[PDB]
């Protein structure tokens, strides 16, 4: 039977329908951001994923040590050898 | 409660159940996504040190601001 809700009630009914729709749209957008099918499905873009995260950042990390940390390690090794030579000289004196 | 009113209640409750489960899904997905970004921040935090301590080659605009 045709359900004679109040006209205000009917309007707010269409409004909840609209809210359901754009909530589904937002869900679809968030999924698209979280899709793992970047360039696997028909597409050419990328999504936030290991392609951009640790699998991509560890790619940078395993090589960045060559310029940044190994350089400091070199002079630290020099300083270690120097204090070793110093304590050897002290032992020779003592 | 009128039959029209009652039907509106049960329809309303059904769509509340749908909204509740869909919000639960959205919350879980966003939790995972933000955790992934937190992991990205954690792995990248170590790059600031090398950036600042390597600046001494050439900075340009920062050197200009120092010189301005």
């Amino acid at each position: 039977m045709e359900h004679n809700l109040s006209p205000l009630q009917q309007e707010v009914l269409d409004k909840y329908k609209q809210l359901s729709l754009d909530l589904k749209a937002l869900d679809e957008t968030i999924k698209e951001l979280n899709y793992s099918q970047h360039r696997q499905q028909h597409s050419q873009q990328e999504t936030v994923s290991p392609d951009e995260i640790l699998q991509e950042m560890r790619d940078i990390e395993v090589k960045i040590g060559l310029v940044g940390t190994l350089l400091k390690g070199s002079v630290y090794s020099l300083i270690l050898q120097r204090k070793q030579e110093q304590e050897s000289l002290g032992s020779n004196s003592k | 409660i009128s039959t029209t009113d009652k039907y509106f209640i049960e329809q309303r409750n059904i769509v509340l159940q749908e909204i509740n489960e869909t919000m639960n899904s959205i919350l879980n997905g966003l939790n995972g996504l933000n955790i992934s970004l937190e992991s990205s921040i954690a792995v990248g935090r170590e790059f600031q040190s090398v950036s600042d301590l390597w600046k001494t080659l050439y900075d340009g605009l920062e050197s200009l601001s120092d010189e301005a």
């Binding site: 350089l71 400091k72 002079v75 020099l78 300083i79 | 301590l53 001494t56």
Partner: peptide, 21 residues
Amino acid sequence: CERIMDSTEWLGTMFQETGLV
């Protein structure tokens, strides 16, 4: 040798800035 140590001073100042040598 002075020209040696002069030409490589940019490396020296880099290594000093981060190693506090």
